[PDB]
């Protein structure tokens, strides 16, 4: 049911999981590099989640700020997207914001 | 300055009354300016009459985090969290060559005018 929207329309949560929903974490650049177990198994049921998805781009911002590409390969047609968002570092919540991104990135590299 | 412009950049969202420029800047080649949209779009921002047929592409926040490359950048401007991604368009829906005009028509258009 949740699984039957395009991928990039999909919402994670504990009953369809970041891993069911976007694949497994890893290196590949087809592949995501971010959450922590708790995350990947929460979705946005996670305690955090809020906190997260005030960095994640409006539809708008996102077609607005991002440089935005097509590419055909084998496995098909694809739009391409890439950009960076400014953290406000004169928010007091700003130290706790780097510490949730540090705790979710690339932390699969750690998993057991 | 415009009420719209007092969210953070990412929750910005533009419109006839607060357009892609004044929300994300001028359209350009750099590396973190963006590419996307012809003046119609430009202008009118999700008021576009056609903004559906791109918002389509447009990551959930859940699939924004769990589809992209995420990073973390501090530089002398500040912390950045870095994206790269890419959303796969279904080559099966009937409506995916008028998709690829669409886009097309939007990515690097600023090239063709001032
Ligand atoms: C009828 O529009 N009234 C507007 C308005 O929305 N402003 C406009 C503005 O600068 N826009 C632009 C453009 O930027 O080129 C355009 C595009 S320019 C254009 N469109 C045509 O369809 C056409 O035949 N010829 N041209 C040259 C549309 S109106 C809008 C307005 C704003 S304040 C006020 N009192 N009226
Ligand atoms: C002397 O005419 N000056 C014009 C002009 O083209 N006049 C209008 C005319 O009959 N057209 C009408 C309409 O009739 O509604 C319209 C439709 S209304 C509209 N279209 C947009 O694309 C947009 O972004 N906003 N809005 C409100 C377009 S301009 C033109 C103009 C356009 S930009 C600019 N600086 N001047």
């Given at each position: 049911?949740a699984?039957?929207?395009?991928?990039?329309?999909?919402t994670?949560?504990?009953?369809?999981?970041?891993?069911?929903?976007?694949?497994?974490?890893?290196?590949?650049?087809?592949?995501?590099?971010?959450?922590?177990?708790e995350?990947?198994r929460?979705?946005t049921?996670?305690k955090?989640?809020?906190?997260?998805?005030?960095?994640?781009?409006?539809?708008?911002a996102?077609?607005?700020?991002?440089?935005?590409?097509?590419?055909?390969?084998?496995?098909?047609?694809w739009?391409?997207?890439t950009?960076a968002?400014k953290?406000?570092?004169?928010?007091?919540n700003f130290?706790?914001?780097?510490?949730?991104?540090n705790?979710?990135?690339?932390a699969?590299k750690?998993?057991?």
């Amino acid at each position: 049911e949740a699984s039957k929207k395009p991928r990039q329309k999909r919402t994670a949560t504990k009953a369809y999981n970041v891993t069911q929903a976007f694949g497994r974490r890893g290196p590949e650049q087809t592949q995501g590099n971010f959450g922590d177990q708790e995350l990947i198994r929460q979705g946005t049921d996670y305690k955090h989640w809020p906190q997260i998805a005030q960095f994640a781009p409006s539809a708008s911002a996102f077609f607005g700020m991002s440089r935005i590409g097509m590419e055909v390969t084998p496995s098909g047609t694809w739009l391409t997207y890439t950009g960076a968002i400014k953290l406000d570092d004169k928010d007091p919540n700003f130290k706790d914001q780097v510490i949730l991104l540090n705790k979710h990135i690339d932390a699969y590299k750690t998993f057991p």
